[PDB]
Structures are given as structure tokens and as C-alpha cells.
Design a protein around this ligand. Structure first.
Ligand code: HEM
Ligand SMILES: N#Cc1ccc(NC(=S)NCc2cnc3scc(C#CC4CC4)n23)cc1
Length: 371
């Protein structure tokens, strides 16, 4: 019962059935994007980017073409800026790609950098459209290097977003039940949300079968990095012919995901409060979500607190149903921390401490919401 927040009841915040091809006015863009592994390895990518003609965004008509093109030029920008991923950076992004990229990003109210809604939510397809949404029947649209495990990283994350869609559709009835004062309906709605969050934990387990720790840490993580607070581009990136000053934009982060923020909001977990670093980062990352999903989070915050409603009723059954979702959220973030230890902390030993303190802070705040 959500209206124009661009939430799908099957795939949630993910883009349903993303477009795979752009108009023929843009083959020059997509030939580069489709061959990023070979163009980067051979050292040809940067020159092809500098060889491109400046195209107009006026031939991108519908919303899906605008999102796919945003994914196409976002991966090209990452490839051009980071190159072969070994430290030799580009600090200027050529005008014939920088101007249409920023023009399209202002059109979609997104920053001109690859974000979570680009390479996870809009970077997928079904192998055969009549078989279900499972890893074996899905594939990504774009990757950076052969063996970067971008498919495993993006698809498993996407599958977690799909598993969360089952709990998102319950949100309108949680709020309807509190307003209409229906305790029994509220209890069932909370237990249904807890069940869906418990089952999303099992989807997290698939990351061990499709992502390699060395490939993720030494390759994939490099291409998703940004230029805010980064010593490699200490002043940001120069977007040619759009700004004359260098601009800083944060690297891709799953803090840009709306799924875990929307359940923090729904359950009254004030992840955005307290003035700490973690609360600061999660609020800023809302600028990197699609505006419709930004608006969905805002309206969720406007509704009455589910936590304070449950606390004020002296109802043990309602409290335990609320605690089941909070526990399910804690379990997701605890298992996720174990993944970070395996895929970042240990590879980095063979920087990583500030990341785990952020995730520990976010999990600790979730845990202290227990009633
Ligand atoms: C190899 C696998 C993974 C690694 C190494 C990893 C690592 C990280 C790191 C370093 C952060 C903090 C910096 C940032 O936000 O980008 C983070 C945040 C986050 N990641 Fe992942 N992650 C992995 C898989 C996943 C998956 C499959 C999901 C499913 C949605 C996910 C969801 C999140 C969320 C929601 C956050 C925000 C923090 C929070 O809400 O608690 N991660 N992850
Ligand atoms: N050293 C070090 C180190 C420092 C920071 C990071 N942060 C990363 S890769 N954040 C993205 C992320 C985190 N979790 C998940 S699930 C799906 C995605 C995605 C995506 C595309 C980028 C938008 N993500 C990793 C390593």
C-alpha cells in the first residue's frame, strides 16, 4: 500500500526488471561499459574515454533508461578514475563523459558517482524470465575486472534486498493497526516482519560461495571507492566542463541501502541520533539514495513511533513480538560483522578498524533497542 515511493512488492527497493540496452544513440557508451575487463587490462580504456564524443541526455526518455545509463557511466567513471586498480589515479574526468554524467545525475537527484542504487539495485537480470529470483537464474549487467566477484557481491546483496521486500509490504498494516488500535493485527504484523528478517539471515550465507576474500579486498573494493576524505584525490575529482573546482563524493556504501535504514526507522531505532560518527554517516548517505526512497524514509519517520506504542501498552506479547524483529536485526548485523572480519580484516593483515567500529556502533545501537 505504498504509492510512488518506487517500492516493488516483489523486489522491494530494487529496480524491477532493469533495462539491459540503451538506445542506439549511445552505443559508444555501452561498448566501453560492456568491455571494462578487457579495456582496463589492456590499458585502452582511458584513451577510448578521451576519444568519446559528447552526447546529449535528451534521448534517454523513460526512468529505466536513465537509471541504466547512470549505471553505464558510473562504471566508466570508476574505471577511468582508478584505472588498473593499482594506485595510479586520474584526477580529471573528461568533459565528453563528465558533462552528460552530471546532467543525468542532477536529473535523477543523485550524486555523479556510482552508488548502491546503481550497481546493486539496477545491475541485474534474470537468465530466463519465467524461473524464480535465485542466484542460479540471475546475473549482473556490468563488472570491472575478470575475477573481481562483482557478480557474487552485487547479487547476494540484491537477494538480501529481495528477501526484505516481504517485510516491507507489512509496514502499511503496522501503522494502520496502531492508528485503528488493533492490538491483535499489530502483533501478527510484527511477528511476520520478524520471520522475514530471520529468513534474510540465511540469504547472507551465500556470500561465502560466490565472493573470494582476496579478490574482494584487492580488486573489487578498489573500484567502488570514492573521492571524499581520500588521500589519493585529496581535493576531490574535477568534473570537466561542469564545475571548475574539484568536488568530493563518497565511495559506494551499503549505508546507502534503504532496507536496513527503513527497519531502523520502523522499529524506532534512532540510528541517526546522538551526534556520533556513525549517525553522521548514515544521514549523509541518504543523499545517495533515489529521492523516492529518501521520501519513503522521511514519511516513515513522520508516522507515530512503533516502539513507544508497544512500550506504553503493558503487553508482554506485543513487547516480545517487537523484540523479535530487533533481535533479527541484531543477528543480521552480527553475521555481517563476521563477513567483514573474513573479507576485509584478515586480508588487510596479509583503515579496517574504523569500518568495524562503525558497524559495531550500528549493531550496538540496534541491540540497545531491546525492551
Ligand atoms: C563480502 C561481503 C561484504 C563485505 C566485505 C561488507 C562490508 C561492509 C562494510 C566495510 C561496511 C561499512 C562501509 C560501507 O557502508 O560501505 C558495510 C556496511 C553495510 N553493509 Fe556490507 N558487506 C558485505 C556484504 C553485505 C551484504 C550481502 C549486505 C546485504 C544487504 C550488506 C549490507 C550492509 C549494510 C546494510 C550496511 C550498513 C551498516 C548497517 O546497516 O549495519 N553487506 N558492509
Ligand atoms: N579497506 C576497506 C573498505 C572500505 C570500505 C568498503 N565499503 C564498501 S565496498 N561498501 C559497499 C558495500 C558494503 N556492503 C555492501 S553490500 C552491497 C554493497 C555495494 C555496493 C556498491 C558500491 C556501491 N556493499 C569496503 C572495504
Amino acid at each position: 500500500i505504498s504509492k510512488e515511493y518506487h517500492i516493488d512488492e516483489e523486489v522491494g527497493f530494487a529496480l524491477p526488471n532493469p533495462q539491459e540496452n540503451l538506445p542506439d544513440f549511445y552505443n559508444d557508451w555501452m561498448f566501453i561499459a560492456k568491455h571494462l575487463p578487457d579495456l582496463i587490462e589492456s590499458g585502452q580504456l582511458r584513451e577510448r574515454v578521451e576519444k568519446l564524443n559528447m552526447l546529449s541526455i535528451d534521448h534517454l526518455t523513460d526512468h529505466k533508461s536513465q537509471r541504466l545509463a547512470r549505471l553505464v557511466l558510473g562504471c566508466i567513471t570508476m574505471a577511468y578514475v582508478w584505472g588498473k586498480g593499482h594506485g595510479d589515479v586520474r584526477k580529471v574526468l573528461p568533459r565528453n563523459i563528465a558533462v552528460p554524467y552530471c546532467q543525468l545525475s542532477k536529473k535523477l537527484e543523485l550524486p555523479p558517482i556510482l552508488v548502491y542504487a546503481d550497481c546493486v539495485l539496477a545491475n541485474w537480470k534474470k537468465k530466463d524470465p519465467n524461473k524464480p529470483l535465485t542466484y542460479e537464474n540471475m546475473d549482473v549487467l556490468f563488472s570491472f575486472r575478470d575475477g573481481d566477484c562483482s557478480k557474487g557481491f552485487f547479487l547476494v546483496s540484491l537477494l538480501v534486498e529481495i528477501a526484505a521486500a516481504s517485510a516491507i509490504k507489512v509496514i502499511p498494516t503496522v501503522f494502520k493497526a496502531m492508528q485503528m488500535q488493533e492490538r491483535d493485527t499489530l502483533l501478527k504484523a510484527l511477528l511476520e516482519i520478524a520471520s522475514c528478517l530471520e529468513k534474510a539471515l540465511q540469504v547472507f550465507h551465500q556470500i561465502h560461495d560466490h565472493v573470494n576474500p582476496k579478490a574482494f579486498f584487492s580488486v573489487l573494493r578498489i573500484y567502488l571507492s570514492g573521492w571524499k576524505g581520500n588521500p589519493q584525490l585529496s581535493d576531490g575529482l574535477v568534473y570537466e566542463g561542469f564545475w571548475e573546482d574539484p568536488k568530493e563524493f563518497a565511495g559506494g556504501s551499503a549505508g546507502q541501502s534503504s532496507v536496513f535504514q527503513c527497519f531502523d526507522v520502523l522499529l524506532g531505532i534512532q540510528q541517526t541520533a546522538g551526534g556520533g560518527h556513525a549517525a553522521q554517516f548514515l544521514q549523509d548517505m541518504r543523499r545517495y539514495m533515489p529521492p523516492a526512497h529518501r521520501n519513503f524514509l522521511c514519511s516513515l519517520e513522520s508516522n507515530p513511533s512503533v516502539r513507544e506504542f508497544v512500550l506504553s501498552k503493558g503487553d508482554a506479547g506485543l513487547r516480545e513480538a517487537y523484540d523479535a524483529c530487533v533481535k533479527a536485526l541484531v543477528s543480521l548485523r552480527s553475521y555481517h560483522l563476521q563477513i567483514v572480519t573474513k573479507y576485509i580484516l584478515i586480508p588487510a593483515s596479509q583503515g579496517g578498524t574504523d569500518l568495524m567500529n562503525f558497524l559495531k556502533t550500528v549493531r550496538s545501537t540496534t541491540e540497545k533497542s531491546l525492551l
